Amino acid sequence: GSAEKRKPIRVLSLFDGIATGLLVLKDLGIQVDRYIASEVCEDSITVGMVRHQGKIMYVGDVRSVTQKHIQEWGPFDLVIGGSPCNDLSIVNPARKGLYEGTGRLFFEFYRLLHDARPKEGDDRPFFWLFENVVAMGVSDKRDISRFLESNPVMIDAKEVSAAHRARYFWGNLPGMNRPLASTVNDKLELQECLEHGRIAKFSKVRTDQHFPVFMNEKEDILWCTEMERVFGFPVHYTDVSAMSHLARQRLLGRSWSVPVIRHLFAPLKEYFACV
Amino acid sequence: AEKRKPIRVLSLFDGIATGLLVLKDLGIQVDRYIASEVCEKIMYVGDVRSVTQKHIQEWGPFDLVIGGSPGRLFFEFYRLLHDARPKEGDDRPFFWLFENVVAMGVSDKRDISRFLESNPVMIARYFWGNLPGMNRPLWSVPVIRHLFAPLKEYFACV
Amino acid sequence: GSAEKRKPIRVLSLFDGIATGLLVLKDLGIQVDRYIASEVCEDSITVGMVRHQGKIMYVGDVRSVTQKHIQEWGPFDLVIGGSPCNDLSIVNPARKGLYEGTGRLFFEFYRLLHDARPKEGDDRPFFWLFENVVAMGVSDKRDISRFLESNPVMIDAKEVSAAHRARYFWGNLPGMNRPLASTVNDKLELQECLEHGRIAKFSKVRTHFPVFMNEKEDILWCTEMERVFGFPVHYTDVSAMSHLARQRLLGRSWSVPVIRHLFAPLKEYFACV
Amino acid sequence: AEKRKPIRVLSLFDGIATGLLVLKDLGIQVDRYIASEVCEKIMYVGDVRSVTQKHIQEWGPFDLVIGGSPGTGRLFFEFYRLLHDARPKEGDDRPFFWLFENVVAMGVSDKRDISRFLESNPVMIARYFWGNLPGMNRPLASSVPVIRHLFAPLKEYFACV
Ligand SMILES: Nc1ncnc2c1ncn2[C@@H]1O[C@H](CSCC[C@H](N)C(=O)O)[C@@H](O)[C@H]1O
Ligand SMILES: Nc1ncnc2c1ncn2[C@@H]1O[C@H](CSCC[C@H](N)C(=O)O)[C@@H](O)[C@H]1O
């Protein structure tokens, strides 16, 4: 209840991927003091390095970040993260679960978040966000909710984009469960995402025996630019680092839906400096 | 502090009474001993999945936190440790021990050493702890008694 | 010496590649009535089909085009073409020469050009351009010059870009040998073509590892190659192609500033936006 | 179309004056015979590489253009350039004939390419003969006396001695 000039936001982003968080914060006009990202995939690091002009400070493997590092690099105002899901998804019959394999990476989040939260008696605003898949074991979801002391919000990107993408979002961001706004920028239909001379079989996309686009006489799969449009990224956002079409598709498949993250981040504008 | 007081214990150990047995074996007074298990006033509280941070607050404060088995149980132990730790600025004594078998994934051993900021005592079993003497560089009852011996210099003995 | 309203240009482009000719004509402001392209590579066809929004009329293999087709699809004001060079380059030791292999594709050009030439007594302006590599056999170059009744102009894209690319241009375009203009859009240095956080080892790429990033040395990216050859960034980011496929398409292409230099005097002959 | 005049010939045939011998064999008057070879008023003019459109224009007009030999691409494409340079311009309905011989042993792609460029299907005889003389009109496929039989219709278009 006291007055002070609003300051730019300080972000710790774990499992950053293609820097969707920084992109969304920039798109909202929120000034970013600093943006520390933990990421191991070199292609994703190159995407974030190029597209944001060396602003991101990369720190490598999340398991190489100590509590002392969080204290010395901080304070942080926002801690975001979406850990790998291959060992959480029920589609994988070889899944090792939340506690083994790559699932236990979640606990790294749980670790660093606890290292990053303000000490008791510090009333400064502090927000965090953890994302993962809906198609996980019920026990895994219960245990994540237990460790994070929060029940998740289910958001499907199909409501504000042309992609079937239901995800769980744990966090304390203001108004996470509030209804999503369908604006004019939203490309609700797959047809709006296709390149010239292509027709969409379906209205929305799924994560076989389906080539979701027709071109002239032939069937065809989605292109990376059209997938970027589907996921809400700028066109040619992932056109860096000389990677194959399949690697680019992999990167886009693991990412966050840009409009969903924009919806989740929008209330931050009333807490931090805005350009 | 102002005098030695009896110890208060939180046990996620495999075996609800190993810690209380060792403590009474060392002659250390016990003001509280709360036992929980992983599954799939001394009191048993059942599944650790039912123990919230609020429960740890209400039942606490705790002076000792023990866990393990002679694994996923480590992360539940770590959660209870975080929930029972004294807040920053509280210099009151607080100790913990986690035991497991040496026959574990090398990745698992490294992960536990990282999370606990401590290297294990090799004895065959691995014992992580912050008791004096468990500082290391880079049944199971009598060994835990030997490791717990420094607790006699921090809490009231009868 | 007579008056008439300037009309949009009608183009026949053989071995069109990624439609560099249409791109250059649009960039000069020249209105394009029609653009008929012969091309067989489906990646290139998709590039030109998307980047120009179905304006290009594709006709497939150049060998499937007859004289009747040229008459019926025409008249044409500009006939351009750059035939495959892998059987003309002395770099290739398995080259079959101008008269065999893919070299003889040149004669298809020679054929269709003669089918598109205005008949005697037709004073209408008519222009043509044929392109190929300098590193060809001297006999093959002599033979091309004899068949086309023209001597080639040597233009190296290194003068208006960051790429070593010397090519022979036969044609009757006005002032092909005139000096090239180095403008402000021209990125003469490889450094000006790199993405953020990369340093250029050399001033002009000669297509080793041409760039440095952080601590590792690296090769050129496709967007950087696009900047090097004068194309818009992400011009070839279509059709789900591997990095080698994009590299292939860009390596066979024309240098955009060079084609702009060659096409610019056409503005005094056809309708301009 | 006033009256029959002696024939004028341009020969890129491998085997000089073969066409002249065949024309004399058929009793056709010859007003001009220009002969050239590919290498690597009856004249031999040497390398076809030295013959230009202007030379064809000045030595012409020509009524008959012959080429071939009893890779195959170079010979045919030189013959093709000469055929193009000597052809009557559009609107000139004067008689103009050509013949190209090659061996049957050739790449199928070569045969299809020659048939495409000449807009004619070959007469098989073993050798291949493309031409526009009456009788060499063929549908789609699935020693000088040969040229004598092929050239027989020429004595109905040009003056005979
Ligand atoms: N040990 C580790 N430390 C840091 N990042 C890791 C990691 N193991 C996997 N990752 C990364 O975590 C990411 C999870 S997918 C999340 C991507 C991100 N939310 C986006 O929108 O782009 C993957 O990109 C993977 O490369
Ligand atoms: N038989 C044929 N008919 C038509 N095009 C052919 C062909 N054989 C090869 N080509 C095409 O001819 C092109 C020669 S490279 C010329 C590319 C073009 N000048 C550009 O700037 O993009 C290649 O793209 C190749 O695909």
Residue numbers in the entry:
A (entry chain B): 626 to 832, 845 to 912
B (entry chain E): 628 to 667, 680 to 709, 728 to 780, 791 to 805, 893 to 912
C (entry chain A): 626 to 832, 847 to 912
D (entry chain F): 628 to 667, 680 to 709, 726 to 780, 791 to 807, 894 to 912
Provide the authors' own sentences about this structure as they appear in the paper.
Size-exclusion chromatography analysis of DNMT3AR882H/N879A reveals an elution volume corresponding to a tetrameric assembly, suggesting that impairment of the H882–N879′ intermolecular interaction indeed reversed the polymerization-promoting effect of DNMT3A R882H mutation. We then solved the crystal structure of DNMT3AR882H/N879A at 2.65 Å resolution. The structure of DNMT3AN879A/R882H reveals that whereas residue H882 assumes a well-defined conformation to interact with residues L883 and Q886 in the same molecule, its intermolecular contact was reduced by the N879A mutation. These observations reinforce the notion that the newly introduced intermolecular contacts by the R882 mutations give rise to the enhanced oligomerization behavior of DNMT3A.
